Paper text:
Eukaryotic DNA replication initiates from genomic loci known as origins. During S-phase, each DH is converted into two active CMG (Cdc45–MCM–GINS) helicases, thereby initiating bidirectional DNA replication. Cyclin-dependent kinase (CDK) inhibits DH assembly, which prevents re-replication by restricting helicase loading to the G1 phase.
To determine whether Orc2∆N can promote MO formation in the context of origins with two high-affinity ORC binding sites, we performed cryo-EM on early time-point (2 min) MCM loading reactions with either WT ORC or ORC containing Orc2∆N using the 90 bp synthetic origin. Although MO particles were amongst the most abundant single hexamer (SH)-containing particles with WT ORC, they were not detected with Orc2∆N, even though similar numbers of DHs were detected, consistent with the biochemical data. To ensure that this loaded MCM was functional, we tested its ability to support DNA replication in vitro with purified proteins. Consistent with this idea, a 2.8 Å resolution cryo-EM structure of DH assembled with phosphorylated ORC is virtually identical to DH assembled with unphosphorylated ORC.
Residue numbers in the entry:
A (entry chain 7): 232 to 385
B (entry chain 6): 258 to 429, 443 to 463, 512 to 763
C (entry chain D): 2 to 106, 131 to 200, 204 to 303, 319 to 340
D (entry chain 4): 177 to 203, 215 to 283, 295 to 730, 740 to 852
Amino acid sequence: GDFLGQLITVRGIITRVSDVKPAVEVIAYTCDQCGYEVFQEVNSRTFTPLSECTSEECSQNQTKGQLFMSTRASKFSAFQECKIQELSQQVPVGHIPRSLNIHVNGTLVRSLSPGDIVDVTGIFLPAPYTGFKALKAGLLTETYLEAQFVRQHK
Amino acid sequence: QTERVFQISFFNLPTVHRIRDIRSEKIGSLLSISGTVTRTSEVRPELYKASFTCDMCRAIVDNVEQSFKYTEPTFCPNPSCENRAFWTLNVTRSRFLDWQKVRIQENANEIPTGSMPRTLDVILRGDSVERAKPGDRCKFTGVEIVVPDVTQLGLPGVKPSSTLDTRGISKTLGVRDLTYKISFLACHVISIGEINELKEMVKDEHIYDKLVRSIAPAVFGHEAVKKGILLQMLGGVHKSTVEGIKLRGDINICVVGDPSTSKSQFLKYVVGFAPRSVYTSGKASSAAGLTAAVVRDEEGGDYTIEAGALMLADNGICCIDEFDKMDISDQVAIHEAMEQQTISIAKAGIHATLNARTSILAAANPVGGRYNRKLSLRGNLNMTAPIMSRFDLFFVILDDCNEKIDTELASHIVDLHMKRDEAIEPPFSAEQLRRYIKYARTFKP
Amino acid sequence: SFDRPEIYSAPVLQGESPNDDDNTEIIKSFKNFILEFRLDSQFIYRDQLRNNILVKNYSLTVNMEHLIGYNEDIYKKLSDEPSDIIPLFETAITQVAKRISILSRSLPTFQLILNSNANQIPLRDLDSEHVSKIVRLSGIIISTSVLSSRATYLSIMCRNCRHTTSITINNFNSITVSLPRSCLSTIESESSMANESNIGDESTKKNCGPDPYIIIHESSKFIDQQFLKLQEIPELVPVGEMPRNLTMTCDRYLTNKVIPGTRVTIVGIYSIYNSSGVAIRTPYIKILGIQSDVETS
Amino acid sequence: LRIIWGTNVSIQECTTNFRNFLMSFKYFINNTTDEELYYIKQLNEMRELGTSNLNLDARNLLAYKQTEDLYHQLLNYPQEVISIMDQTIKDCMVSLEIETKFYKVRPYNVGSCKGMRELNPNDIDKLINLKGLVLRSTPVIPDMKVAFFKCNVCDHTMAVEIDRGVIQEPARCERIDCNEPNSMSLIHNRCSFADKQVIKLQETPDFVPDGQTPHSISLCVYDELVDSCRAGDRIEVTGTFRSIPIRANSRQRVLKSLYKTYVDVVHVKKVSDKRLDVDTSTIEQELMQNKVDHNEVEEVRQITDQDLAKIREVAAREDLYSLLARSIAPSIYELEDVKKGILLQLFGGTNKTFTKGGRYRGDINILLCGDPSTSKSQILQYVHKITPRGVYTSGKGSSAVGLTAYITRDVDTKQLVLESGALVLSDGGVCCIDEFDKMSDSTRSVLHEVMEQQTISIAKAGIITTLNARSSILASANPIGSRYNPNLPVTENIDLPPPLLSRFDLVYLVLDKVDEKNDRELAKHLTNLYLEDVLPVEFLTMYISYAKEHIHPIITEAAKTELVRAYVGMRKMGDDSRSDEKRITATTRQLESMIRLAEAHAKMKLKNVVELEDVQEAVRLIRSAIKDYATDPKTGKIDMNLVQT
Ligand SMILES: [Zn+2]
Ligand SMILES: [Zn+2]
Ligand SMILES: [Zn+2]
Ligand SMILES: [Zn+2]
């Protein structure tokens, strides 16, 4: 927990890599009544779409237009998620190797493949808790790594 | 004193549509379709015209039309009360109909190349209930309807949605999903697929030989098996003693030969001729597919049995190819069907005794590919002792090297290829033979 | 442990063509009127607005018959539905004064004071017709209460979870906004760690209470409100009957402008409030202008 | 130059740019069709035939100087460009019912691209093409376009149009007399619907980056292209690249930030120059349904008359049989007897249908036994890649469930569906089983029915039915031990029950002998390939498809005499050597094999009459395959001094 919010490098072996899918960052809407464009920000894993217009004109007039999604204008990012495991020479005597999660965005996708030994530069950031409710005591959080630069030993 | 519900029934349309040709531009029209029936449910009452009581005032509103859903009144009739949402149901003074659900499947000859069969749910009302049995080929005339479907939430594409128009409302949120699947509601159900000739048949004093020579005409020779199959299609007598001991009256046959012999053509003949027959193979069949399986209704509150090969051959002949590739688990069920005529089900808390009064036609390969004439019959077969004991006739097909027989056989085989079906000229036809068998089974010697 | 997402906009296309009874078109027509309308060769209202902003009087006095020769439609609407149009006419003045201050170098809503010289209904000629409509009245003042304090900007906090928010009021004519009854932290599931702080305490749901909002007074702003009573001229009264009177309400830049004993002309809206009979309401007038015949020196 | 916002398109610009090209198009060049006004014949013949779909190849436009711009614009903004292209047609048609009929275009030559998984999010709303094998398709789904509302206080009926998926339900009755709040009810069966189907495709790209396991894709086909694809088909598809947000669960209106991907299909191609045409004998009713549905997906290829003249010019050649056998595998130095069997397997026997029920099919089954270190493996691969439908199986890598059928959970609908197996996917094609001798007795059990009746019977939980498996079997087996031993009989060299060996039409003993001029020729053959007459692939496949499509051979009495004589002669041989399993005992399946091979040889050379030469050639081939010209009928041994290359 001392390492959250820092720039750190890791050494491990890649066990699984996910495909490339779009991740929405800002959604775009078009109102037929006013002709403005509404931009909604998303930073969760689930969001709720807007229904009514939030433009100045529609906000003033009683008649408020209805929103529709325009796929092309939206803000999209390329997303991949990787699992990294300990090397044999780092595990203590008698214990089992542990794992960690890595995130990749932008033009850094499709650079890690399963079975590679790498050194990854990332930013260590927290995420909301995903365990059992009955076992929750306080404001517990999960950790993930945000990739910035990849090195391969071979 | 209530009014009598009336139902209209159309039939004898120009064309019959295949299941794999139903489109969505025929929704809400009259059409006729074909299929094979697998599963039926029990008869349950259905809400048709209901009575409601107001909760603000106590007034009575009667004869509300439901139309496929649980509709409620939208306005108190009293010019004073302004109730539009709060109602209670009098289940004592409401009018019901009878309701059953049937499951159908595509026919074997109508399936395209490389694809699997399709299914469809059929709704029956009123007096049309309980006319379709499992394992039947029926034609349905009715109306093509749509019902809600929540399984489509996840499929790719744009899924239509509903909302209320806020242009026009004075001011100083109810989105519903339009997902549906195609279902069928039926009004007519029909199951599809003179004495002068019968009394002419009974007289002829060579009728037995003609009947023998009319069976499996495509196969050459092997008259013993032809006689056995006829005797198996005719049957014996069922008797009961004072002590409740049941004397069995079905004949069970086994044909033994190696992969070279023409033993599967006999089975294919019987599955094409006899009224209630099923063809199953050793390694493409599971135990549940022979005895029975239990599934739960979406409607809730009950369960349903789905028939297997042995239940679909009740009072009939079940055909099993490659009997030697059967498991001990399957053979213990076959033995139960042979000594008793019952199948016992105990799974998921359901107990049920079912009837399997069926005859067994089975083809078995010798244990080592070929038949050893120096061993006994038991040494050549791979069956459990209880199963072997209850078989009546064992027919073994062995090969002989004789020149004249080979000439005749080759002539026959080539004739069939050259002359198509003008190479048989049997004494009797299939439609003739079915009628005689039906007549013969009603005598008690 | 993430932050608050935002919503923002920008103009792109021409929407549907504009209906003339649209609110924005009303605001634009009234803003054109302010900087265009001429009498002689002097642009009276722009000069007036500039001068008033120099001396910190956030108000504009409009003679009502100057508009029945410029745009009769917006005049009919104002005399027919005053409560809906006055807030709209109060946006244009602020928008204009905003530009004036920025080019001539925290501005509240501007007050519109109406002054008129036209028909005068007597105080006994008031009926059900004139309700939600503009009337012109004459009389004598006999009462003036003490100034009361009313809020315009409120900052609040929840005594259980410590959630903060704000409230803005620009409608002081009723005599209403109230404090929220439930904590708004739950309905604004805003942060990803906020909906997680809302849970815990073994198995239960965060319950803040029935009404948990406290007002932080040093962070709030207020205005003044007064009550007056007008009486019919004591001379043209029915013989042997007590004179009748009406209750009037005023605020902001209209307070302390008169004293009892003065004969005045009032322009206002005839409205009601609830205070024997199946369904009876009490009338009162919202002040929009004051003009005194002559004062006692 | 009005520009549509968010694009670089000018509608008038592109319409006028398109109508000049459509009224004037240019292009080893002819003077009959290569130098004539092209597309006005295409339009005129379309309107004459009574047709509604124009099929528009793409690279046509990357040459003509004007419309180059339009190619880039079509590969970037398919939505806006295709509405411009239709108004050109219905304007051009009357320029030449045509005031109430709708026209469509279907691009089918978009190229480049390197697979679905190489596409980035910046390729959304773009036009791409795909190739692969179909596995599943859901039944038709009704999609709503126009809705029906009834006023429950006044019985006034209203209709509404879907606008980008959303339906606007009126709040107030429209009647000036009955003006109620919330009186509108929806009647589902009075609404207008349209067709939707979902396909699952196993993508087969050209570039496979290091370590890509196969995956599956979802395709949405609407209206006309319904039931135009069946499982087992190898297709080429053009469509748009989309994305959609999904709801987390049924109860909540909440969505998931990670999007879901699919393809909107516009054109479908079910032909290839380098592969054979499907068997029309198995799709008779689909052809009838396509005409009733007015979908112009073309299944068989077009034959011009110059090419058909070439067909008979070559069919007249004296050395047709050698030439055809030689051009089958032009890079496998091997005996022509082996290749002739593959050639006759491709043609297949005559399929016969009885009118009292009872089907006889003409599928040929071949076994390739012999030493290892031979070119058997290449033959199976080459035949896999020339036949339209096929699956390649290993010996110890198959299960009965994996060959017949199985039940699976769909990750989209979360329900249980039925899926096809290896042998059912091979209906009307070739199935290649490698290392047949290494396969279990449980898995070998299922092949008996497919080799006898060409069906499968399944009695499992949920399905009780009979399936069609009209497939050809091509199998290769490894001899016991290091090499084939001429001193032992054949039944002792192959680990397969002798009764099973008699189910195959042809059995090929591939033997290795050390001989100096054969070795020299093979070495020169192989070395010539690492440097820098026969019929090319296109013409071979075209000829075979023509023959398989039109002609149908029927046997004569002169052939019957020889067939019976040959069968009796074959049986009489080795009559004493039957108790001891030295040689393969003859059965009736050998008679049927002679019938089938005579019919196939007749079909080759384009006859409708099987004469005596065909039966003599068939018997010659059957004996030559088993090497009966060097076998001692008493001991079962082969004299290798007599086995010549
Ligand atoms: Zn708007
Ligand atoms: Zn009531
Ligand atoms: Zn709180
Ligand atoms: Zn109405």
